[PDB]
Amino acid sequence: EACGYSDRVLQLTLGNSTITTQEAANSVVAYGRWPEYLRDSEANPVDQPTEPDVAACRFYTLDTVSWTKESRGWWWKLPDALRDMGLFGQNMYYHYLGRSGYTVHVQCNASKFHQGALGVFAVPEMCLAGDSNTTTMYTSYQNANPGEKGGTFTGTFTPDNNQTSPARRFCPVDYLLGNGTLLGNAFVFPHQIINLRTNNCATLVLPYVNSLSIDSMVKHNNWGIAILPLAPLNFASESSPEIPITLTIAPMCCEFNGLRNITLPRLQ
Amino acid sequence: NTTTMYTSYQNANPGEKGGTFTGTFTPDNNQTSPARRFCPVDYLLGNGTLLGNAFVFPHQIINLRTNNCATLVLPYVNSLSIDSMVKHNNWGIAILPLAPLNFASESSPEIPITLTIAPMCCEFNGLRNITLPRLQ
Amino acid sequence: EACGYSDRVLQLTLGNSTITTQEAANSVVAYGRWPEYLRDSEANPVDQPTEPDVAACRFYTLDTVSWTKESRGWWWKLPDALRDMGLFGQNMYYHYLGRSGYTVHVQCNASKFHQGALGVFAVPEMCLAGDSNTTTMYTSYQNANPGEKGGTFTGTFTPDNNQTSPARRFCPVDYLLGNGTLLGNAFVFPHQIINLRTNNCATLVLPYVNSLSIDSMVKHNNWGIAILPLAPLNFASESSPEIPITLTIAPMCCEFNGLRNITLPRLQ
Amino acid sequence: AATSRDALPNTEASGPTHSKEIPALTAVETGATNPLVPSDTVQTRHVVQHRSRSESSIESFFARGACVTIMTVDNPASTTNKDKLFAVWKITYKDTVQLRRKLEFFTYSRFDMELTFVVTANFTETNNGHALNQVYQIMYVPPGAPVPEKWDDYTWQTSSNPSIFYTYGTAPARISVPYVGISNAYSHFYDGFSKVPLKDQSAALGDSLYGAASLNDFGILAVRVVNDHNPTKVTSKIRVYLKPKHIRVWCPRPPRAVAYYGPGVDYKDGTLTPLSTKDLTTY
Amino acid sequence: AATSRDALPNTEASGPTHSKEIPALTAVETGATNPLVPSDTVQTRHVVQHRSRSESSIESFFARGACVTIMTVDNPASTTNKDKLFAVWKITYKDTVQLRRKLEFFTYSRFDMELTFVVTANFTETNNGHALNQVYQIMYVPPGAPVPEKWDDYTWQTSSNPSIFYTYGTAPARISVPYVGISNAYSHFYDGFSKVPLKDQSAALGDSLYGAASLNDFGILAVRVVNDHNPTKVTSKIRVYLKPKHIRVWCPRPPRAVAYYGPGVDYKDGTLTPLSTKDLTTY
Amino acid sequence: IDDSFTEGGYISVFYQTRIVVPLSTPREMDILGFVSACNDFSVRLLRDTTHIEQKA
Amino acid sequence: GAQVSSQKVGAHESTINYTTINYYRDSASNAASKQDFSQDPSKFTEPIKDVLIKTAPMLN
Amino acid sequence: GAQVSSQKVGAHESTINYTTINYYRDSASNAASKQDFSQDPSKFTEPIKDVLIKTAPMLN
Amino acid sequence: GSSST
Amino acid sequence: GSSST
Ligand SMILES: CCCCCCCCCCCCC/C=C\[C@H](O)[C@H](N)CO
Ligand SMILES: CCCCCCCCCCCCC/C=C\[C@H](O)[C@H](N)CO
Ligand SMILES: *C(=O)CCCCCCCCCCCCC
Ligand SMILES: *C(=O)CCCCCCCCCCCCC
């Protein structure tokens, strides 16, 4: 626009929170579907839903991670990454059922002299592969659900050989997208790339996706966020560059059914 | 009777257990480590006014021969439209035996009293991190 | 504009002089009033005014000063700073009375690797504080009127202790805006900031301001220009960076009354 | 449209009754008062009622100036060792008891406040010296403004604070003030604290008085004798009268039944037995 | 047509946003302040705003009498060696500080001036003699008119100067004066001199004070006790209060931040540190 | 004035990612901050300030 | 701007009236009119959800 | 020559008015009406030559 | 002019 | 007579 508006400069406001950016590469709406509340024709639990609106549909910033030349990649699951986030998390643990969409904003700035490219992928049902070749489908609830810290990818598969006290965790190999399929094809999932010369952020608007209208948020993650270095970090001629990556995520149109006492999960 | 308006936040706010009335005023004589709690005398409605007049406040009586419950629907009342719920209580519920419990000829009868309360039309403003009060 | 026009790119033309800029931060018109000639309903001296038009309403460039890490700030007074500028100055000294507006263009470029921010303030009646704690209101005409060289601010008040031959000059302390009020509030005066990453100039269009329609330009300054480093000059890792600051100022709609022989002031 | 000075309802004549209508029987458990009138339980005649409730309207009940404080000031000889006394009073209706008890029939109120000032002076030493007529300055110092530290310091300039210069022996001074509360009504009772004690903070740090809201609710009145020191000392008193005009009140309360003990609802041991002996079957 | 007592704008309810509109991002270099309202950066509800700016209109901000001076006079015994004291004051708002600071939020002003006079008297010697009620004469002597040299000389005739004869113990005296400036507005600041120093003239001859315009800007008030000498000496003080009515102001300025030091903008060494210690990351 | 009952809360600023610079660039810099009122802002009950005085 | 109202005449010696003019801009400066309204006590005397009919049983 | 204006009524007990008559020839003797106007802050808050649109970039 | 109640 | 505002 002749009044200055740009693809690269955006402002997002949800609840009492605002994000600004001056180096965006537009933003993505997964499968072209904006988040919505559950329609009566698709409804299933009959009790009056709780819809926290601004109390939960606001931007929550997770712990900042660090990108280096040896970084193989990071992953988070939703709603798991937000289970301890203010009133969203409370609403989640107090109800049997819950559904939610999300605005995911990945942040990573650097300088005109740095280079590198992060693939930011939102994957529906992001089932990851386990560390075991003695027992399949064995990753424990606690290890499958890291909360906000997330998990990481590895360049090497290493099988858990402790049979007496097994680690019971994922071993997500990066070129296999942590799930036995080639990473070069992950672009069929809703994505953006943070290529440092071009943009300093990724924004993905995710609808609630599932084979059900509503489900157990505590038992099941709907979306996975996978961030992998498609082109490695590099800067000037420093051997050990570092730049931070921050995730800020907002629940959208979230509603909950089946209110009771609060869930107190075994997380360690 | 050494310091007025001295009841601590912790003692003013018992949470769900509530507090009780007493038939006797007894002043806290520990000046070194004061109790800092209420001493609500029953015939003075715990506040220096006669209990027989408490009926000007919204009320019901549970008279056992007649009824087994009281139901009071309370509007939000205050000199402001909204306020700090953590700093300020809007309503007090006071339950006093106007006529003492009695049964057959037992000397020590007991019957339970249960309170069930529902918030209505509640709304909140000024969202931030959670308040973690000093309650003990 | 889709034909390329920008807030940042301006051309100003007055008389036989043109200024161009490619890194402006828009321009300011003090109190929203453009300069004007004196209207008949507000007129006071009855003699035919002299209105030099292009002979005086043109851009005059003053002596360039230098910004360094130890710079505390600079000041000029108008019309004083222009008293020796071509036919404007002549017209000024030949007439008892004169009034004028101004376009003030402060110039300071650097590089994408330098940083610093100059507050450029236009102050009506910029009375400055003196160096004395033995005699108030004692700054001499000669010291109050530096002409184009201007004066400077200081970080320290130091009282003139020579009682026998007093300096009789200003001692304008920077955080007190040289006048006993806090500099952080100087933004209520018409201003712009030259923040090196953003812009390389400030442009202020000043109306004639006074409690009279016309007055003695030789006795009285209407406006003061105060330039202070709000954020200090810095560059790469050099300890002693320097960049120049140039002032170019044009009188606007100036008119004079009360013609006689020329004023020959005691300036030293 | 029913006004405070309207006559109350007429008594309608009523005769004998024998029916299933039972006005006399009721059940106070419900929380209601039985709305009966004499014709419900006895035979009545027709009476045209002329009486009205005009004098017990909220306005009429409060339409009186009540003394809320007495401020003492003086003007001594210049030679005295003691400082010239000027007075400072924190504005309140709780230093005296009568208006306080009337307002406390209600939980909340709104009103415009009329303050009237009665000023009296006298001699103290068994002297024979005289004093010329005194002028007094009553300055309102709202929360935040500099409180005077000396009878003659810079604050008495009053460029922005409202002040009354009262001349002795003239009519008592009077001003009005609007409803100035920071809430939509004045709270006669505040069941709460001005601070939340946090766990992560020390107990001293989270502490505050029970039932107290703004520490300096309404500011202070500072009063002085403007005249310079005089050889003979004169002492004066300024009595302050408060009248609530244009008043509204909400949520009725039982009146104070035992002596006031502080600005809160606290009571003192030994004052808790208002009622006197009277036998159940004695008229 | 928007008046000072009109309610301010309502808050309009606003929802979530995801667009190229960037209200939050701005550039203060331009010299402008970003005109934002809460609905620009957070979700808002609809609120019907009732508050107004009525009390901060220029008129309301200045609508108070401020003390600008205290004049001392006396009336001694006829036998005294010292002359009867009459007072002479050069009219100004700069002898005190509070009204001065308020006016100096602005560069220029126009107003009608209301002057109110509070008069107090006392005895000085530890005598027992009395004095009958005093009448005071407050004479305005404009620049050029003969200033009184003695409490009783010919100038107190006042054929043309305005005078107030005030009777002690009566209501404080009061007069109004129009906007009397010789400019179109009063200048609170004059960056200039009243003389041009010429080269052909000596430096002493061309010299004048910085920031001073007419040496006798507005003239003086001369005050006396009209009563003849009395055996017992009485001393009186006349306090002068200035209120700017019907006021207009131009060109806002940062307020005075360090103590006033003279009628100009000068400051004194040792008074230049108004701000107190507070740590950057401490609430 | 400072008053617990009418307290306003907390303003604070944090690093969301970090400041990043290339080589040949200053590694430290300043930010400046400004405050102003919105169009819904008002004041009342005129009073004297403590920000000026006249001792003697 | 004069307001003319009637007095309720108690002891007698038409309608007798009296006049009122407000001298000040601020309504806070005004005297009290005493022209006040009455209301029904029901919010305190009958705060029950189901309307009470006094000839009927209060409990049914 | 009486001027009749309305009061903005704050606490309540139609439009309440008050009356004003000027007693003197000189307008300087008059009380202050307090019937004042407000203006937009723009000459101080937005003194820029090109009109500012707050949703747009301030610099383009 | 005159109001009448 | 009477003005009215
Ligand atoms: C020149 C004298 C001016 C005097 C100005 C007095 C202004 C202050 C008004 C105080 C209002 C007091 C009202 C009574 C108390 C409060 O109702 C309760 N404590 C609850 O808020
Ligand atoms: C019988 C008593 C009559 C008193 C008459 C007083 C007339 C003089 C009016 C003085 C006006 C003073 C206004 C204030 C000061 C000026 O604003 C500044 N110094 C700038 O001109
Ligand atoms: C309405 O008021 C028009 C009639 C005016 C009647 C005479 C007014 C009497 C004097 C009032 C003086 C003004 C009070 C400030
Ligand atoms: C306009 O003023 C016509 C109405 C007159 C009303 C009565 C005036 C009250 C007394 C004013 C006296 C004159 C003041 C010098």
Curated annotation (Swiss-Prot), chain F:
Superkingdom classification of source: Viruses
Location of the protein in the cell: Virion; Host cytoplasm
Leader sequence residues: none
Known function: Forms an icosahedral capsid of pseudo T=3 symmetry with capsid proteins VP2 and VP1. The capsid is 300 Angstroms in diameter, composed of 60 copies of each capsid protein and enclosing the viral positive strand RNA genome.
Subunit description: Interacts with capsid protein VP0 and capsid protein VP1 to form heterotrimeric protomers. Five protomers subsequently associate to form pentamers which serve as building blocks for the capsid. Interacts with capsid protein VP4 in the mature capsid. Interacts with protein 2C; this interaction may be important for virion morphogenesis.
Name of protein: Capsid protein VP3
The organism of origin for this protein: Poliovirus type 1 (strain Mahoney)
Residue span relative to the full protein: 521 to 576 of 2209
